[PDB]
Every structure is written in C-alpha cells, then in structure tokens.
Design a protein around this nucleic acid. Sequence first.
RNA 1: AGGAAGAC
RNA 2: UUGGGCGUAAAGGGCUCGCAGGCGGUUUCUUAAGUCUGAUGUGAAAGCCCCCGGCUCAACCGGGGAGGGUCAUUGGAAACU
RNA 3: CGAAGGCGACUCUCUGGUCUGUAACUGACGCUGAGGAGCGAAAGCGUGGGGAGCGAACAGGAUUAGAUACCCUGGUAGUCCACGCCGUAAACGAUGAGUGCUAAGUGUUAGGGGGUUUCCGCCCCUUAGUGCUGCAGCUAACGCAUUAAGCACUCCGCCUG
RNA 4: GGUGGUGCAUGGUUGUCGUCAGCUCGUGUCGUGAGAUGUUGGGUUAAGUCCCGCAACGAGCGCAACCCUUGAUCUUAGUUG
Lengths: 218, 164, 206
Amino acid sequence: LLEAGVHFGHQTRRWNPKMKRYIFTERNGIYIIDLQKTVKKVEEAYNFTKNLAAEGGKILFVGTKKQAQDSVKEEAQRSGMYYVNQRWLGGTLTNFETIQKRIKRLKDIEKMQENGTFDVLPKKEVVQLKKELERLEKFLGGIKDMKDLPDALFIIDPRKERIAVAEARKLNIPIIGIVDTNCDPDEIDVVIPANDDAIRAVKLLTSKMADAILEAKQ
Amino acid sequence: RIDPSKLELEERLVTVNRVAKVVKGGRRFRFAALVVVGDKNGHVGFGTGKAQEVPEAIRKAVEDAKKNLIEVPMVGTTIPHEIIGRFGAGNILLKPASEGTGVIAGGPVRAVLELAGVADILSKSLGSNTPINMIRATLQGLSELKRAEDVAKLRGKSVEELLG
Amino acid sequence: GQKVNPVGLRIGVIRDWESKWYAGKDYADFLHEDLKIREYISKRLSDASVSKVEIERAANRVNITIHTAKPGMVIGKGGSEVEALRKALNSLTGKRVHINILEIKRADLDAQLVADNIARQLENRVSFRRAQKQQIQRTMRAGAQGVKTMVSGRLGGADIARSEYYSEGTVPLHTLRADIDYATSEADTTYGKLGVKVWIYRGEVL
RNA sequence: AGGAAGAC
RNA sequence: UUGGGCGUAAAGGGCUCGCAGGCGGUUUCUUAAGUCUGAUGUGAAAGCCCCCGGCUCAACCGGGGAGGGUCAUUGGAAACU
RNA sequence: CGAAGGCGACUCUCUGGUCUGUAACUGACGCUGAGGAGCGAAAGCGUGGGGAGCGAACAGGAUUAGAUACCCUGGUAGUCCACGCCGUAAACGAUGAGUGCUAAGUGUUAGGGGGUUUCCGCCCCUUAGUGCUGCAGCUAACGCAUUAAGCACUCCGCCUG
RNA sequence: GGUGGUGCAUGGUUGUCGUCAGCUCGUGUCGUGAGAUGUUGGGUUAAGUCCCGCAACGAGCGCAACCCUUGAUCUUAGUUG
C-alpha cells in the first residue's frame, strides 16, 4: 500500500547533497517525505510501465544485493518479468550475439542431456557437463528466453551496477531505478528516491509495480 | 539519438596508418584505418578500426561509423552561421559562403563536409595536422550548430523577428 | 626446427598405408619400380589431379587404384585412358598390371588437391592473398572442421622472403585420433620458387 | 641500509 | 589587435617600497575633449572596381560614377569614457 | 610567523606586522608598476677578534691495472661575533600581483555567534589561514580543481628551432 | 653438363631458446592516439591446470589426455617352447 512511513531512507550524514540550495530553517532537522511529489512520481512511473505493458515486454531487473536477490528472483518468477539474481556479466547488451549463441548452446545441451545418448562413459561426461550446466545456469540467470533485444531495464542500485546504466546509455534503453541519496538522480527525470537496502520498502514497491503490470497486462 | 541503418551511405575511406607494437620476438604490425561514412542528406559519422588486414580494418571502421552517426543542419545547402570546432589542438573555423563558391576545406575536413553534402563552406585549419584530431574537431563543430527555428522556439519568438 | 610431418606421424597407428604388400629379398627393386610407376602417374596425370595412388601385389600381378575425384576430363571416351595407360604401363614394367579409378565425393576436403589448387593459382598469377581467401571460403562452403594454410617464399617482393599463414577452425596437430590430411606443393613463378603447405582437420576417429 | 669491479 | 602562449615543451623577474605611466564602486546635475551623425570645401589627372562604345570581344583606348581622410569649418545627439 | 631569504633553549628593553568582532568615523583615499631605491640562503673578499666539533686544500693507510675518488687516521682556510662588500641558487608551488563568480566531503591553527549551563562536551552558521580526496570545466597526457592550471577584467615580466 | 660462385635471391629440411609455458583472435567496453582489458588478483598444480571476484564473454595454437613400450590377471591360441 502507498502509505510510506516504513523507511528512514539513508545512513548517516556523510551523504551526497542534491537538494541543498533553497531549503529554509526547519525544526525537524531532517527532510520529511514529500507525499505529493512521491505520489506523482509513482503515478508517472505507473503510466510509463502501462506503456511498457502496451508494447507488452514488461521489464528486466538487475541486482546484486544479497539480502534482496532471492526475494526479487521469486517475485520475478511469480509475476513474469525477467531478472539478474547473481553477478551480472559485463556487456550483455553489446555482446548479445555472443549471449544468444551461448543460450543456443544451452538449448542444445539441455536437449542432449535428456534425449540424446546419455551413457558413453559413466562419470567424466557427468562431472564435466552437469557442473558446466550449473555454472552457466547460475551465472546467466533468467535471460534465457528472450530471442530479441530488450526494451527496458530496472536496476537495484546504480552505484553497485554502475556499468549497466553505461551500457543502457550507449544503446539508448529507457532506464528505471531506485536510487539512494549518494547516487546521481540528475540524469533522468524518472527517479525513485527511497531506501535502496530496506527489504520491506523494496518489497512493497516491487510488489506494487508487479501487481501494477499484472493488472496492466489485461 | 541513435540513427537506424535504413540509409544509403558512401563509406569513402580517408586514411590508413601503419601501427607497430614491440614484443620479445621483434615487432608486430597492424593497420589502423579511419574512414568517414555518411549520406548526402545531412548525416555524418566517422569510424576507426585496428586489424592485421586492411579490408578487415575497413569493414570494422565502417561498422563503427554505422554505429556512431550524427545529423547536421542543412538549411539552404550551407551552414546557418560561423562556428569554430575546437577539440584536441585542431581548430577548424567554419564559415558559410554564398551559393556558388564550392567547398573550400582541407583534406579530411573536405572529405567530411563533401560527404555531408554542404555546397559552400570556407574553412581554415588553425590547429594541428593530425587527421583523427581534425575529424573529431569538425564533427564537434558540426554538432555545435543549431536551427534558426530552434533559436526561435527557445527564445519564444518567430523567425521573421529573428531575421529582422 | 619445425613440426614433424603429420601424415608420417599418423601412419601405422591410425592411418593405413598406401601400400599393402610384402616383398622378401627383392624389396629394393620393387620399391624402385613402383616409385617409377608413381612418378610416371604423377607426370602424366598432374592435369587430372590425382590425390593418391595405392598399389598391391597379386603374386606377379600388380593392382593400381588411382583417386582422382572426377571422371569428366579424365576418362575421355571411357576406355581411352585404360588402354593408353595399361599398354604403356605394361611396356614400362614388363609385368601384368590392372588399373582402377576412384572418386572423392565432397571433393574440396582432400589436401593434395587443395595444395595443387593453390599452386595452380600461383602459376595463374592471381594474387596469393586472394588465393588463400578463396580457398578458405571454398573449403568452408564445402564444409570442414579446420584448415591451416601456409605459403612461403618470395611472394612478389624480391629482397625479402616471408611466409603467410591463414587458418580457420580447430587444427590440433597433437591429438593423435585427428585425421589431418597434409600436403606440400611446389610452384615455379617468374619471381622464383614458392612452397605451399595446407593441412586440414576433416573429422574425428573414435 | 646487507663487497671495488672497465670497454665493445 | 584581426590571430599565440608561460606547472612539466622556449617562456613568471629572488622578493618588497614606490616616482612617472596604465586602469577605476554607486547615484545626481553640468560641458561635449574622446564618441556617433548631417551640411560645405577638399583627398588633381591617369590607375583598381561598377556600367556602355571602338580597332575582325581581346591586349588597349576612351565616356560617366565608387575612394584610398584619426582631412578643415559648422550644425545636431548625451548612453558610455 | 614572515614579502622573499628565513626564523626553534629561557628572560628582559625597543619594534614591525596579521586575524576576529564592531558600525563610531573620513568617503573612492584604490590596483599594478618600466627605470629607481631596499632587503636577499650558502660559498667568497677586506679589517679586528674567537677557534670546541665538523672540515675543502694537504699528508699518511688501504682498494684498484692506474685511484689525484668513494673508505680509514690526522688536519689549514672556513663555519661563530662585530663592521663593510659581492648580489647569486633546482632563490621551487619549476605556478606574477589584485578583485569577483563556480558542486561537495574531511582533518588541523586562531577566533566570533546561537540552541537546557557561568559545569564538562554536542550540534549549526561564520571568517582568515593551512592540508587531503573529489564534479562541471580546462589540459597533449600527467594532472589542476573555491589555496584553479576553471570562467572573466586591469597592470607587469618573459619566449619565438 | 656443371660436387663452380651466390643460404644475405629462394622453397625444402634442421638446431636453438625449450618440453619453456606461454603466443594471439572474434565481439564488446576504456582511451584523441599508440594502446589496455580478456591473458591481471586469491588459493593449489609441473603447467595460461582447476576453481571464486573482476568490462568483460568466448574462441584458437599450445599444456594434460588419446599413441607406443615396460609394469599383474581371465578367455582363446601350445610349436620350431
């Protein structure tokens, strides 16, 4: 539910100030949540992802925050969008020919492990191939069944996945990300300022967006 | 703003260069080819590529130039105003001319401007004579320009009271 | 200071010989005579581009089979080559001969023909780089698993002699069950003398 | 912190 | 000046006090030295350029305009120096 | 702290500046500065002292092919004081002086003001230094970056293989 | 016809570093560029051999295995043993 009141928002006062210039003297001593600008930025994100559902390709997420990775993976598997759960390999959007020929080899090995000749030597093919499947299926993630170029991207943290937005900058992908206050929100007007590490807050916002596109798909 | 590949482009190469590298067994030798690629309708890009074979460097450079394109203002087959392209110790002064002079430019700059399709530009090279630095200077210069109607809509006025 | 010849390294263990017989106490003059057959076959069939010949003894009869991969400009009317070869070979060796021909389907994977193709473009005086790229494209469009090509000598520059290599795919020279076909050809041009070494990884042996 | 040692 | 530079490429005086010199915060009246703009007389004629004519365009020869002025007298403007 | 060179035991006499606060004054008195004048590390020179240690020169012992050097033992001039002189250094931030704008983080030196205190400290402004990271921007890179090598204006000095 | 000169006019062979463990490419990022990355770092190995972070993801020649021989046994095969 859109109530806020859950997250404090940040760590201590070694922070990057981006709103510092015209704030008058306040007796609170810290910023209060701007609920009107919060609800209109959530509304414009809602309308943008309504358009994303209008073309139909929903979203692919990336993250490496291990307190939230299994949670965003199970949310991705529940609600149908795509995910990067473990370490995100570099240059996915630019080496997509190599990625698609690699995922073609995953289709070949995943059909030959069950349909082809299984026993030609008992242990060596097992200890090579099953470990090789485990490596690629843990390091590749849920980007298997695209068969196309991606349309949009969401990031858990711009500082942590810093080069992903650089690749999206180069190949002109519209970008979505929750940012912390040490991040750079200056680039895109579509911004989600909230606590990047509060598991309850990130589950609330990802659940709201997942249900939003679930009711947007029809 | 990336431009699609649905255009006809003339990919006239400008310069290759013999490039060395020293290792324990002597020297390894590659070719660095830079080309300029762009249609006559006002889109220009440049490309660079290193290879052990010259046509391989050519196709790599044309693929990079197809990757990186930028559009120039072409109102009245001549640039709207005077500009100075400034990057990297090459200074290309670009000045519009009357409609019959023809393009007056040094070699790499004339390659870029003729590939753009400008008819009358007087330019002078006030910086270094390095061809890649001339190319980056003249593309920064052509990027710097802006429409008369763009100046009109940003100043909130119309083109007749910009011109007079 | 180079690699040992791969066909000579593979013969006897994986590669069957091109000669399947025994001679006792007359071994020397049978090797002299059957190399006279092999040089005569090469000299009069270089136009027909034999890949290999292979012989056997039939108790004072000899059987020759010749691998040429085309009947077209070779067999003539069909009996012309067998009469003009069998009577001539009878005249040379004085022994009963029999001759048979064999063809290679998917005919661009045989190394001796590939090296002869490179050599033929070198007396055709088209550029060596175009020869390498066209032969690489021909071998991949025929289909293969690996090609390595080498041409050494004075390649048009008079004052320096240097080799050029062009490869694609995997050609391991150190796996034994690999079936490399290797070939060395010699080309004589007005610039001088050029050596071609092409070796092809066709398939695998279990 | 623990030797002087030339030239092609 | 139009049209370069000085950390390491050639190029910051070893540093200060100061004469002459070179620049000068805001406002309000005042003069017109600098500034800008008319009028007159001059910057000879041939030359360069603009427009026409002649030797079988032509090279050239002519006919009419534009100036190469921080030029001299005088009228007007007061924003800036 | 000093304009620079430079200045570290303590006390006294004389004396030059610098910073903070105030708003009580005068009301543009300002910046820069060719020539000029004055300071100016060490070494050096003249005159008179003083000479513990260190120590060019010089001599003995080694090492080396030689070793007029490094290394060892001595050791004169010098280094110290007073009065003058010469006027040079990688005299360095290899960055001329002055004034004004341009994101932040964090120490340190000398202050001023506020929030429960005239208690210890805790936070926030605030100058004037003195550092270290680090945007835009500049650079050919290194790098510089409110102590600019950024964006400007004035004056000076200097360069043209 | 030259076992005559030219290995610095050449192919064809060979040694050497050295059985040393290294040498590169495709695509893509960073750099004005030469270039860099992968191929560095940690733990072991004889090894760039294996694995974990990493603007890298992969591939190729190499390394190791497959080849031969010497190391025990079952079946078949016993002469010229």
